[PDB]
Amino acid sequence: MASTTRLVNDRKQLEQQVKDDARILADARGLNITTVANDSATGGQAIRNVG
Amino acid sequence: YVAVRISRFQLEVLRDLHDLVRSRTYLDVSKSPLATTPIRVVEYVR
């Protein structure tokens, strides 16, 4: 029970902080949206009324 | 037999030689020169 028993939590906090400041400064470069089309047809068997 | 004509012709008369003088606007590079390079900013995370 000393300062050596606080290393794992220290690493957790350090990891979270590094993940945050690696993204605050990263540049924002937006991409161009493409591949948009109507390709969601639905199949099945017809009714074919008899008479 | 039929003649196609127009109306409202806009032309400018002068009546003096001095009226051929107009004015433009230029940049004075003597005291407001053109920049050559950007500012080169550097950032640090708080």
**By the 8 A CB rule, do B20 and B14 touch?**
yes
Query: How many other C-beta atoms lie within 10 A of the C-beta of residue A21?
Result: 13
For residues A26 and A31, what is the distance between their CA atoms, to the nearest angstrom? 15
Resolution of the model in angstroms:
3.7
Give A24→chain B minimum CA distance, Å: 8
**By the 8 A CB rule, do A20 and B46 touch?**
no
Q: What is the 3-state secondary structure (H, E, C) of B26-44?
A: CCCCCCCCCCCCCCCCCCC
Give B5→chain A minimum CA distance, Å: 56
Whether A21 sits inside 8 A of B45 (CB atoms) is yes
Tokens of A14: 């350090």
For residues A21 and B46, what is the distance between their CA atoms, to the nearest angstrom? 9
Whether A24 sits inside 8 A of B45 (CB atoms) is yes
